[PDB]
Amino acid sequence: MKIADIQVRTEHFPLTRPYRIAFRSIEEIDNLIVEIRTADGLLGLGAASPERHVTGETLEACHAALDHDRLGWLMGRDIRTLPRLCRELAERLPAAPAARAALDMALHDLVAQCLGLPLVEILGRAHDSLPTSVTIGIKPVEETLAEAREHLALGFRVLKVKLCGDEEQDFERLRRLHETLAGRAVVRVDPNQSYDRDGLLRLDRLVQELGIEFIEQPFPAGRTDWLRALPKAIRRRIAADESLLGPADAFALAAPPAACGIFNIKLMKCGGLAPARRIATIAETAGIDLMWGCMDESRISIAAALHAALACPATRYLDLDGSFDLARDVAEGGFILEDGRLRVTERPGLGLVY
Amino acid sequence: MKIADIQVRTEHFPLTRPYRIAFRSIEEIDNLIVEIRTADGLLGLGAASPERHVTGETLEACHAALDHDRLGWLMGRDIRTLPRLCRELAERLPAAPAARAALDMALHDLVAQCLGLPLVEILGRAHDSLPTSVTIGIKPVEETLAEAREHLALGFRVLKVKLCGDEEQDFERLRRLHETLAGRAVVRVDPNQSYDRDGLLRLDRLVQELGIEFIEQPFPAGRTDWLRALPKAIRRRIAADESLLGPADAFALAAPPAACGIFNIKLMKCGGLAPARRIATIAETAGIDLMWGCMDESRISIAAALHAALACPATRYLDLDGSFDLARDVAEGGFILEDGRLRVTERPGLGLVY
Numbered sequence: 001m002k003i004a005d006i007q008v009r010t011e012h013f014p015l016t017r018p019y020r021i022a023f024r025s026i027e028e029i030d031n032l033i034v035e036i037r038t039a040d041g042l043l044g045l046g047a048a049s050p051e052r053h054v055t056g057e058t059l060e061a062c063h064a065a066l067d068h069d070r071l072g073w074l075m076g077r078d079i080r081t082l083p084r085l086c087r088e089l090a091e092r093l094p095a096a097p098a099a100r101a102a103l104d105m106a107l108h109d110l111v112a113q114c115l116g117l118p119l120v121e122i123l124g125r126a127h128d129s130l131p132t133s134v135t136i137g138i139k140p141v142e143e144t145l146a147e148a149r150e151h152l153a154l155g156f157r158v159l160k161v162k163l164c165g166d167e168e169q170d171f172e173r174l175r176r177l178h179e180t181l182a183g184r185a186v187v188r189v190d191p192n193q194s195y196d197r198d199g200l201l202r203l204d205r206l207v208q209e210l211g212i213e214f215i216e217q218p219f220p221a222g223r224t225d226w227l228r229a230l231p232k233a234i235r236r237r238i239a240a241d242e243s244l245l246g247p248a249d250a251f252a253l254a255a256p257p258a259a260c261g262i263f264n265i266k267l268m269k270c271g272g273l274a275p276a277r278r279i280a281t282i283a284e285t286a287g288i289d290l291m292w293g294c295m296d297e298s299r300i301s302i303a304a305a306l307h308a309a310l311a312c313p314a315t316r317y318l319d320l321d322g323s324f325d326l327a328r329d330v331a332e333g334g335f336i337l338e339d340g341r342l343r344v345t346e347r348p349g350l351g352l353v354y
Numbered sequence: 355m356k357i358a359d360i361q362v363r364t365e366h367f368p369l370t371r372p373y374r375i376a377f378r379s380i381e382e383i384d385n386l387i388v389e390i391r392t393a394d395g396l397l398g399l400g401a402a403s404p405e406r407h408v409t410g411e412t413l414e415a416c417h418a419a420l421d422h423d424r425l426g427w428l429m430g431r432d433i434r435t436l437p438r439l440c441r442e443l444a445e446r447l448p449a450a451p452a453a454r455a456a457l458d459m460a461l462h463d464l465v466a467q468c469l470g471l472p473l474v475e476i477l478g479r480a481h482d483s484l485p486t487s488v489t490i491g492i493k494p495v496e497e498t499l500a501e502a503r504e505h506l507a508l509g510f511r512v513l514k515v516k517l518c519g520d521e522e523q524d525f526e527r528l529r530r531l532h533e534t535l536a537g538r539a540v541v542r543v544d545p546n547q548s549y550d551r552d553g554l555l556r557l558d559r560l561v562q563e564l565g566i567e568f569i570e571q572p573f574p575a576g577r578t579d580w581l582r583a584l585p586k587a588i589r590r591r592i593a594a595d596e597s598l599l600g601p602a603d604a605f606a607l608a609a610p611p612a613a614c615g616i617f618n619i620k621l622m623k624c625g626g627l628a629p630a631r632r633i634a635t636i637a638e639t640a641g642i643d644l645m646w647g648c649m650d651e652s653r654i655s656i657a658a659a660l661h662a663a664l665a666c667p668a669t670r671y672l673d674l675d676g677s678f679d680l681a682r683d684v685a686e687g688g689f690i691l692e693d694g695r696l697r698v699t700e701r702p703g704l705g706l707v708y
């Protein structure tokens with residue numbers, strides 16, 4: 001199939017809804033858009049959203065790694081050799097997982113078009129659709145319930161709530177919300193490293209009481225020893241996010257005694273579908289459930305993540321809302337949202353429309 | 355691309371060279387041959403050689419799992435959906451890994467032909483070629499040297515020597531063999547679960563002194579705890595065979611403290627290329643070396659093992675001699691032997707010829 005050409009550009013996306021995360025805040029996001037064209041005319045798409053506090057990858061570095069000069073070795077390479085290409089991406093873009101993921105997506109986009117089916121069918125289909133959470137950032141009780149209701153009306157059945165580590169505020173938000181929802185959506189929480197050992201045992205008791213489904217990354221990334229020191233049943237209700245970048249992390253967390261029961265895979269953390277799939281093999285073997293999450297991102301990479309997600313039997317949760325609050329985007333299609341569930345189209349490849 | 359027909363038959367192959375394994379003694383072999391034709395005329399090939407003592411799969415059970423009536427679910431299925439098809443093989447033939455492999459093989463053969471490249475390039479190429487060992491069964495000192503010399507003459511640079519557990523005979527054979535070869539070939543050994551703990555330490559001292567590359571399965575398959583009680587440096591020179599069936603075993607042996615340093619993968623154990631590649635992912639992350647082994651088998655499955663092996667960066671060794679001593683076969687091609695080294699032809703798919 002033969003790569004002819006590659007274009008890379010910066011795109012600025014302001015958010016319709018700015019929000020707060022633990023020791024942070026976000027009004028807008030930059031992505032890198034990648035276009036890979038085939039000798040015979042086909043177009044693969046990819047998108048990068050580097051997260052520096054997690055992977056160490058700056059936007060400057062991401063863009064650097066995608067510079068036209070540094071990509072020459074891809075010219076004229078045969079996309080049917082995709083897994084070899086993915087290995088070489090890992091070797092030539094060792095420090096830029098988001099950049100690497102962008103190219104990786106695009107190649108998966110093209111190989112599926114070559115074969116003639118939606119990418120998911122090519123990776124083998126484990127699922128037709130799944131519910132996705134939408135995110136509520138850090139904010140006071142009234143505002144929280146206010147956003148909660150907006151989301152219910154847009155038809156979402158799952159809410160992901162960010163916690164700040166102040167137990168008084170965190171707990172009252174969760175109790176009020178549980179009340180206000182009256183069983184209309186389930187809830188998952190994300191303290192984002194802000195808790196401590198005694199704190200989490202407390203939060204976990206609430207979580208059981210309120211029927212919250214799991215707790216995402218309660219302790220600091222390096223603190224996985226704190227996780228293993230918890231009773232096994234509590235560990236099953238905890239997901240690793242910032243602790244989990246690639247397959248090496250997956251294996252280390254999965255090794256007995258296992259650190260947790262859920263992995264949150266993000267393309268921008270691991271560097272594309274190929275490494276994400278290695279994570280899934282490890283997780284499935286270890287009896288660990290997969291959650292597919294994201295950064296603030298164009299529909300392009302959300303779609304890529306969805307196709308991967310629906311191809312893994314171990315996939316259980318989706319947190320795929322990264323493109324919803326974008327003020328504009330550079331592509332349409334790739335997935336369909338209906339009544340809170342995410343689905344792919346019947347179009348070949350990623351199914352994106354330019 | 356749409357499966358159209360599936361045909362299955364028993365073939366009886368006598369050996370040109372009968373041989374003894376610890377507790378066993380083989381004079382001939384039966385294989386099941388599997389032909390999958392596409393609606394467009396394309397032909398996939400697979401071969402099953404069930405090993406009952408290792409997998410519990412008998413020839414009868416294997417044949418039964420391939421009955422034309424038990425295979426109806428595959429008709430009309432699209433081979434471009436291969437990973438999904440393989441997941442189903444696992445559900446529908448859970449107790450018959452050889453039969454599963456035979457179908458898995460054939461399907462990979464077709465997807466590769468669909469794309470139009472040798473299977474190995476579709477899987478992404480990690481290697482051009484590797485040396486293979488040839489096997490010397492249990493037999494006295496003189497006949498061992500005689501067989502070694504026959505093999506040197508045919509150009510092999512690596513010999514795999516079966517040990518029986520009797521140290522006086524085992525050690526004498528290895529010492530003599532070392533002397534007879536000059537540097538002409540490296541030697542690897544395979545006690546097949548016949549050693550105890552005190553004896554293995556004795557064997558390992560010899561192995562270091564004689565420059566033998568490693569020891570395959572010194573202990574009973576269930577005695578994994580004996581491995582972990584060894585110093586790490588010794589564990590690195592040990593390969594797992596009968597202890598390793600599928601990915602579940604792979605993870606178990608790989609998790610810290612790791613039981614051994616090398617996995618011996620066999621399609622007839624794990625159930626085909628799909629599970630085999632799952633083992634490879636685990637092994638690579640754990641820093642375990644891969645060796646691809648076999649039973650007495652037609653070129654068909656040897657070829658398939660070869661494509662898979664040349665596609666995994668973790669592969670360090672081949673023991674692929676399973677089709678050499680067959681008095682007849684049903685196919686040609688698929689791999690080329692030169693000067694002890696195995697390599698694949700340039701033809702698409704498995705590259706077999708009828």
Ligand SMILES: NCCCC[C@H](NC(=O)[C@@H](N)CCCNC(N)=[NH2+])C(=O)O
Pocket residue numbers: 019021051134135136160190192216241293294295296319320321322323325
């Ligand atoms: N660096 C991204 C911040 C959040 C990451 C993630 N939580 C989420 O809920 C993501 N879906 C956030 C990105 C989606 N966009 C919006 N506006 N919520 C995490 O678990 O760390």
Ligand SMILES: NCCCC[C@H](NC(=O)[C@@H](N)CCCNC(N)=[NH2+])C(=O)O
Pocket residue numbers: 373375405408489490514544546570595647648649650673674675676679
């Ligand atoms: N129970 C497994 C039977 C084979 C044993 C295998 N040893 C080998 O040497 C393999 N290459 C088998 C094929 C050898 N074929 C001939 N004709 N010598 C093992 O590792 O247990």
Ligand SMILES: [Mg+2]
Pocket residue numbers: 190192216217241242
């Ligand atoms: Mg998190």
Ligand SMILES: [Mg+2]
Pocket residue numbers: 544546570571595596
């Ligand atoms: Mg063995």
